[model samples]
Target: NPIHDRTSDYHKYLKVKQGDSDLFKLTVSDKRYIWYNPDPKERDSYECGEIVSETSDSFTFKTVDGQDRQVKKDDANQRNPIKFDGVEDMSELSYLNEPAVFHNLRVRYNQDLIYTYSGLFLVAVNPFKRIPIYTQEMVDIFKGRRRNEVAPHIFAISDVAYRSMLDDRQNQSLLITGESGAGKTENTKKVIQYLASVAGRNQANGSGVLEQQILQANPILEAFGNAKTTRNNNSSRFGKFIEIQFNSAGFISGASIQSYLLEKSRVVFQSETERNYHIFYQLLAGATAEEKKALHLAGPESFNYLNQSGCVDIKGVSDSEEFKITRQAMDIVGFSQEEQMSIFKIIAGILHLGNIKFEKGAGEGAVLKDKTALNAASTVFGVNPSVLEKALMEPRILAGRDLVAQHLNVEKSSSSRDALVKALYGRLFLWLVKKINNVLCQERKAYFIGVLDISGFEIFKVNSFEQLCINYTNEKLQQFFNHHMFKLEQEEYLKEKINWTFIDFGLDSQATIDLIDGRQPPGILALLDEQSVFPNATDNTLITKLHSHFSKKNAKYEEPRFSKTEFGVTHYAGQVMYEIQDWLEKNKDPLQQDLELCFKDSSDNVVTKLFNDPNIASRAKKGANFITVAAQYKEQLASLMATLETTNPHFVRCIIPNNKQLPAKLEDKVVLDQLRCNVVLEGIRITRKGFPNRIIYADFVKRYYLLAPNVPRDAEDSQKATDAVLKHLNIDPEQYRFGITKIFFRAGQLARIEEARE
Candidate 1:
């Protein structure tokens, strides 16, 4: 046979049952002949030739003459194929019988060993595996680090591609994606960590005190951006892209953040099983009486929605302590006392804003019962209570177009106006994010942008349109994987020097932004606007309307449905829901724009109106405008931002499951798939791009792999394992080989088997 005395280093093993004894044995060093019959009654023996195709489903092998033969083994076709040595009953012994094990075996070889395993055959080819293909020496030759390290994920795929950027003077990007609990954000962080560790000048000191401050930003962000959802304990409900700019010396120059899907609705309320973002909980649990008084915040146990939910004192997690740490980080990063106080003041303002209580009075005007609210306003804005009240009742316009305040009548429960208020508050939060980002980026020459998290997609018995938007985001992220695998950006990046690497990043970015801001077709925000305008519209009607626009034009657009009892929808990207009426009334708008504009240009007049408004002043006094505060401490903040801009950044994504298990449920498959695909895609993209950042994921699969073995082994055992592994890895079956089962094999055995197979 052709297999005899072959120079290749691969061997095949066969499972056999001899005399009623089941045994697995290494059959032979050479090829063996097997027989098959097209017609059961026809007694004919034919040798199986080379395999044409193999997958989880079945295998195809050709005859010597090149005629194709297909074998399918199911419950009905089980008895058709007969084996030699009267081993027809051993049909289940073939690798195909345990497709997961077979698939996993293939993945281990391809990913770890960088080899291709074909049908009963293995091929050895050297695929280079190293991060930052262009060393510091090489980078120095090309005018140093050039602001940021090439993404590690991209560096792994092609050293040539990594070298090209430095050689040709091109910009390169590493696009990271994944569902909330899948660790996309954490992976991004690790990438930055790798780059900062290797590519920066302060490596000896290990980021100095500046590194601690820079890293602490994550906790602050988590406090504000992450929340407890049914799918994940710590989930990021928003999307963000951080661009790290580099100076000529290979230092961080500056950074900018592009945010997506803030889920402002969650700021006001949450589902029974879910909780608001950590900031709210932390502010209530961690802040002391003095701190709360300064910020005008009430305790979490006092909130209508938060009070009814689960509240626990988490160890090694204190919001107040976090605040102190954040302050220290800011200091290291270079925030002066004035700047630090400004940030605290913004927090205080937000607390005060939250404390504003509305009551129906006997008269036509709404009564404000909270004394703390007025005090907060007076403290933040340097205004008196009577003047604050006047501003709230009738705000004066400073400019020609600025509307200082609306004419609110207590008799009418104007949900729209309330919505506007919530939007303003949300805007304040956005402003804070922008302010912090600016501080972090000021002096950075190059950075490793680390994203903290994402909220996972959910599939319930009843679904809605919001879910569709979320799912669509996931779909676009998946498309990025395909683009990376196919090298879609090779030409554009080479030609333009614009540093494009992943196609899906652009698609996802645009899709997410559109869902929130699109005008005519309307994204989620638009839909909400429509819903507000037309209360009679059904969720189905809204979804159908959205799909008509979304699916036809956008590749990632998914048609979502509305279930009577279900809270949200299932989109190709992720899942989401409409904010509750009260919650919606309180949170929705991006206020940072107005606030920044107002602060940057005091003469803009909006500042005067904002300051004059009692409600706004109250919120502001509680510690709302950290940007303004930072400006006051410009000396310190400037130093920090400058330092950060020049330092190397790292990214780390932490995906904590809501249920403390991988693959929470079958309905969560869409989320799980997207998470896996995005992580792999991001890692590959960064590696290929020659960035110093390294993506690391916690092994949720390894954890579940052991638990699943305890389940009864049956015909479905292997299939179940395969599904479980894929789900755990958060990857699709077609894109990459998953070798989870092979992880259990000993290193020596694995190496020997690989050699023999190849």
Candidate 2:
């Protein structure tokens, strides 16, 4: 147990035994190694090399080519010892290089250990098969344990945050980020599961109604807000922040859900090979005979909205079975039977509305001769069929000083119809969130834990305004993480009067964020908002205005040389080219007042509330008081950031193993791309570049003064006392730096100090 035990050569050999077992098998007898193909063009193509001759600035190594190649010392990546393989924390590696980090994770992933620690955050690779590690017994093992005492797991992270919140009496946030099909949603559910299990109320009746309500909220949202995309099945189309409130006594008190922009466009149309929201298919497959007949429901192929994409069902998913669970969740969340039926009625109504067809007639007016779909929609909506037809074909508009009925062409009428459907479905989703909050919300003063599950930064083949907004949110979030990690951490050092050269990681994404959301020079969203309020503005006009303002002027804004309608913005992740088609209509989101009036007077209570509720019914004004969709999104994002700023945050990045979504496979390129985008490696580099280990001088002296019996335990000046204690302990000058109020240690220097203290 003496200091010599760790310094002995046999201890190092024993450590190497766990990894390679034959560390001296290489041709070279010396202890130098090489990282071959350091700049590899392909995945998993790197090899180890044996160094033959080493110069002051270069190393000649014999690699797989059987030739001696000399490389610059800076260019040559030194390999870590074989003992560093399969390390639990990558920060512990001797050589913190890209290939080394990748190899460490690769080793761990191969052994069915999907979670690993990278400095401050956790990296989880999605194991496609069911892993038996999430059982309740596993939950008990991680409870109240230190992070290093347990294997890396979602539950481990959850328990740490929970304990931190409880011990500090401060709010905490778990920010889960990843691309589609990357297990973001699955990991999110596990967090809630662990929290509910640990902090759930013990009901005398054994129902645990409050906990069930919290757990069931996910099903309702998934049924309404999630859909099948090309990249992922059951992809979340909306972003949500769920706050699990806890009282001062550290038990579940109440909860609230804040959802971001739902993909309203998906309600009316889906891309090829994709399906609409799960609720649509579930209703069609699981509705009773009497209910189906009453709502005029038909097969999925019978409706335009459901059949447009040609994807009716996802493999291995039974819509009927999922529907039963959805209904049960709704019941458990206290949705009345009448309200449930009414929700389904609105769903069926949208399907029938999508089926209504229009043809060009004599003159500019469109003719809707087929009223079968119209009558069915009107019946389910509880509105008069004649009124609905008039609203669809002709609506009153203010011309000069008088109100006159104006006729619309087929294109105008069809678009207006789709706008109505989008509005209705969007409002329905907001209402459901409100209803769930009403059941779960409690009016009490307490702390809370918030879980944010949002879409990751996206760069797709074709991008649009929605992508712009989604990417913008992620940009802000990324900046938030960067600022929290670097700026604040450095600020603390400066405040503590540390003696150090400030390291600049250069990770600020604020320039790109300001380019998208800034108001001084009118960024993209600001310009769009300005164009949205213009009466004569078209998509072409918006594009022209954007080019006039930003083309060749702003660094982040790029106008494609060959394309007139597409503009590119260099986001934090990468550059994305967005098309300007439908820019005006999507921003305005116009709906006919006549349609609103018809629905507002509906005999159905649910329909009346949907049209009359002030929150859902107030988007119909223009000129000076107008709110564009982008503006609304900007305000919501500002509010979310404000909330996140107040809480201590934990980040969890989920990675997709492969494109096929199968088990036992870890593609290097795929995992590497995520690592780059998520900034996991960059964060690690920043953590390592500076003193990752720091402690206030008072705390340092208080902790290690026992090792130096010569130093007074209650010295007036902690900085001087800490200096004397380190000197008395015979610490190396290169291993520690003295600050005004704290002492900073390089890598494992603190551990050796602790070992000596023991």
Candidate 3:
């Protein structure tokens, strides 16, 4: 009865001080280790040691003989731990593992509520029980409206950080990291929203011109870079880093963006059930009379892949609304009408280019013979028919590189020339991206960088080196976060910014770039290139080599074997085998002589030439084959462009589940439990440090209650939770008076209970 009564008091104490109640100071004696589920029937006992050495996935404990045991986060056995006993004999120590539950509360859908705790501002589901605080109040406290006020909201924390940044003349970065679909992007939007609402110049009016521009850029990016994926309905595949700058007066100065890894190949291809983004469909459907005439482009229905049954209707997706948003964002960002038109014109030109058809000659050359396609291309690009032919046949200057340096003078085969054209077009698509990025950069003086809205690390049934690299990149990012949030910040504060930091953020950046492109060590692309050069090398060998080079010496890399498939390796990142083989042979040679030799060996040439004025018949066959190849290439290119047009460039990483479903079962529970304890301990630490005014414990409890609710509730559990809350508060709990409170609610009942004074 006393234990239950004590628990009730603890609950009330937390509620009264606005959820900052301290447990360690309130408890009369140190029980050292106590059972969580004190039911006499259960034999499990979880000692204090098990809660200390947690990895990202599970909790670990070392036995007296030095052997370690681990339990998964989601395993039913994890919830069966017995509480720790303070006995000196190590043999008697036992643990009960159970799902930790946070204090219960009812959720009301109708009300808006906000909670502030430990530098985090959470939108509470129901604020009636615990009244929500606003940004304005947070700002006031941060600005010293109250003598003992320490802002609890994330916005407030960010504002304080920003203010500190200004005072110290150092740039402040808010790094939000988590797994996909964890609401990372949504939280990022909120942070930006809060900053825009308060930190920008002018009273809440849209007078902060630069800020408006920065905000407007989001829609344009979303329209182009975001896509629907299986994991997240709308997921950003790329990583983005945005830098917000402020002038001396704390007004908005400028901003810059840097992005990594865009899923470019997906632009041309999509799974059967999935559709490309709205912009692709919109440009196809909403082409104006004048614009259509300028680009000589037909509607989306003209293309085979797009015109097929599954293509989405342009009107159904609210494309016009997106267009309007994009236009407004462009205007806000200072994109002139001409500049806007220039972008549209490129889209139209690409469409027109897709329509161009080629015919083959019996000997080694392909001719562009489709008048309708030629006329469209000529119209869209604003080029003469003759010039267009010259550009297609000969090398043209693009992004300072010759489209065609030399023609492989293979004894004239139409198929060979057609392949060359396809290659050039692929390069052109990449060039277009660079061009658009340049345009965006020129429009904003604030170091505006491209926000690459790409897909995430994916491992299909047939995994490859690319998937490995992407996954590795994710691991490095996680490492960076651990450094920034856990190690670097504390070390910097302790050593007075000396070189005592343990985390390395630079590893993330370098690892990312290296995965894409590295010289000596060779990244994914380079490894793939090597595979092309050395055709005899097995995928397994390549994987092993890659793992040895990238992974740590002691670390074991699992070598994934490929299953037999009709298409060979089943899935590959960059190039198909046939395509790669063709490209390698053609490009590896200086003269087009080798390609011609292959043609000479074919039976079709002999059949055509000797029987029916051989050269003419061969040419006709070549022409027909070229037409087919061009059609295929055109469809692929068009589909790719359409996908690219719909993705959102901006992104934020999200938190992961506290279970083994996502990551490996490492001893993570131990760390998590300890962190919870540290948060509570920090609250006590704050009071003991002797600040100028009284430090409230109730306020700290309310803030961190939402962090993790699954921790067990034995004496050790209670102490750990208390410690975690305090650590987060950056204070000790001992110096503060602890008051506890417990509010009970019946199932499916909602009512307000007024306090009855005794």
Candidate 4:
């Protein structure tokens, strides 16, 4: 139960005291010491020292090499007792500081314990390598256990949410946020797995078909939605919320997934050494000869989209093997054989479309000299080859009163082709998700648990429309967290009539959110949409409008004096300068009607639905009814936030230990940045700032009454007994507060009382 023993020499020599610099000096007399970095900028950079002597104002300590160093006594972070090392909950630490918290995490991480409780939420550090803790036996061990009764684990949190849902008959949600490759997706799967095992249809009979389908859904989604990125080997390129539903009896009934802002650009282009979606490589490597022939497919090296990245394969991963599993998952999820083939056809078609090149013609118009790639794509897409060709190079446009055929230049023609590819792939992904839902969504659901796996705050070297949207989503999520963790928390304190003064945590990001999405003064996204609807608007006009509105007016906004195309927004994490390159086109996401008209009538069923889908079709329409991608995304996010608002939410901040994705190495800066940026530290700060631990008077007296013999054993009135016990114990009056029906203790105060009782 404990990491250190009182009988051990190390424990005997370890000296810990609350705010006692003299005690530390005595410990240093026996060569025992603690260390910390004096510079705030150099976090996790500690210099070991022994307190040689101390004055009333400063602590003079010996450094690692025996040199004397002095620091302000108030500034020193008190070291925790060795018994508190790797403690289950951080709230148990007497010294709750940044270095102390991370030191415990680092100590536990070295022992392969990745999950730790930091007050309310679970902090998961990515192990990178495989760990055997997520096995079926581990799940069984955590089943039906209370949070305090078991080792810290994701399964523990999942079980708590499960029991809470059943007890309250209310919805629950696990909002998991992290940067790419921080194991957000892996943890999401484990949550589903635990829920399925505990609540799924009779496991004694066999693994439930519904459970199998739910688990299988992930691989199929990953095949289409995930890709290889610089930060992670298989990074999810989209955000998804999975709602696993249960019936009144608490058996797994149905589940549905909601996806958001899929990275469509990856379909047409990948950065150097990066690959497109996993499905591309899987289809190319895993398809049979006959299947490949039918789809006119080739190796990844042959496709321009895949080959241009200078990488076609991921080390230690067999694309062909992953493809087999993906196919099996699709089959388990109820995809028909024809449907599977049709999906592959669209993938191959997108590949062939990318290969279609445009060249300068005799005049300003572009010409497709070679029709081979065009025919290959048209054949798979089941569209008329001539019509597809015309749509790409020379689509007809209506000017004033008459319809005239307009020829596009080479650049425009290629961009149009890429847009078609992006649309086709993005729509196909949505359609697949919809089809999965049709099988998973049941009408007989009683209660449900939702898991939101979305991107953390992103500040890229070159911020664009996508980054703004992602950061906007995180801003809203952070605001939601602030409401729950800080605002409502202090509100509850005030409601209880306690002697409390609320501290302005300054955690609210509403100002930044308003600058990005607000409509009053037209936020960046709103302005971008405004420019998108105007036919004459360009990226330059959009930047001009943003600068005009917020350059000096909005505190959260900044305009670069030297750069006309760049503007900065002060986000919650930090300020990010966004470039106005292709903002109008990206927002409009325009695809020529001729291309859609061609695909709308495709002989292939899947291709036709993608074009005919009402959401896509409505956006495809021009003029007064036009909706930008940002508008659509905004609507979807509104719906997501609404769903989340109904549920009891649990936050899981996944931490990437290192940029290299290697195990046994936790980069302090990397983990610290995430802890700060992801609001982990803020959560801890607010928790400690207030009384983080509370118990009803009855439970408090029942647990600690033995420490004070004056307390009545058979007390009828809990409040009187609790008061008597506190009076006997003589605990510092400042360490705790008595509420109407409960007693609240500051962080680690309960642990101190418990230690005294022990």
Best by lDDT: 2
* RMSD versus native structure for model 4: 5.7
Q: Candidate 2 at residue 572, lDDT?
A: 75
lDDT of 2 at 657: 80
Give candidates' CA RMSD values in order. 16.8, 6.7, 16.4, 5.7
Candidates ranked by TM-score: 4, 2, 3, 1
lDDT of 3 by residue, 1-758 (tens): 23222234222312122324655333232212221322335533333323344456765544443545554544423211222111111111122222221111011111111222222212221111233343343334344222124423444444554555556555454544444433345545555655655666776554556666667665655665555544444455445655455555666555555443445434444564445544565565566566665655565777533444353443224674456667666666766676556556545444455444455534745555556765664453344555445445443323344443333222333333344333222323323233334433433332111222222334344443334434544443333333334442443344322332233334334544454345665554465555445346655565555556654421122223352211111111221111122322332222132322322232232211222343221223432332222222223333432432332121222333233223222132422332232222232222212211222322333333433453234433222334443323434343322323311111112112111211
> What C-alpha lDDT do the candidate models reach, one value each?
0.41, 0.75, 0.38, 0.74
Which is the better candidate, 2 or 4, if ranked by lDDT?
2
Error of 3 at 546 (Å): 5.6
Taking all chains together, the TM-score of candidate 3 against the true structure is 0.51
lDDT of 3 at 503: 35
Ranking by lDDT: 2, 4, 1, 3
Q: Write the per-residue lDDT of candidate 2 for residues 1-758, one digit (tens) a residue.
A: 33122333222311112333443333222266777674446655467887777688666878776566688877666786575566776776666656667788887876677788776678888887766777655666677888876668888789888999888868899998887778788888888888887886775323267887778888998889888787677786778898778778778778888886877888888886788888888788888777888778767788888887766756676778888899989888878988788898889788888888788877767887667888888887788877988988898888778898888889888787888887789988788787888768878748888998887777875878888888888888876787787666666577447545656655466778878888896788888877676578768888898889888998888988888978898877678889988877777778778888878887778778887887776643544465778888887888999999999888988888888767886777777777777878777674555554333223535554444455556566544544554445646566666555555556545423432212
lDDT of 1 by residue, 1-758 (tens): 23223222211111111233333242312322223444456432223344455435875555666457676533111111122221111111222222222223223223333222221112121122232223333222222222123211222212322333445444444443334445455444543444444344474534554334456666556667666676556665676665544454444344556454566667555665677767655555666687665555565565443555454344233466765665555455565666445445544444454445556655655656656665664476444555445445343434556645544455432232233344444555565565567765656343233222333354444333444444544444443444343354455345334453343443335555455456665665555554433236555565555556565566444443543222332343344443223212222232323333333333223334444444444333423432221122223323433443332222222223224433322222232233232333233423333211111222223332323343233433332424443333434332222334312211111211211211
Worst 10 residues of 4 by lDDT: 9-18
Q: What global local distance difference test value does model 3 have?
A: 0.38
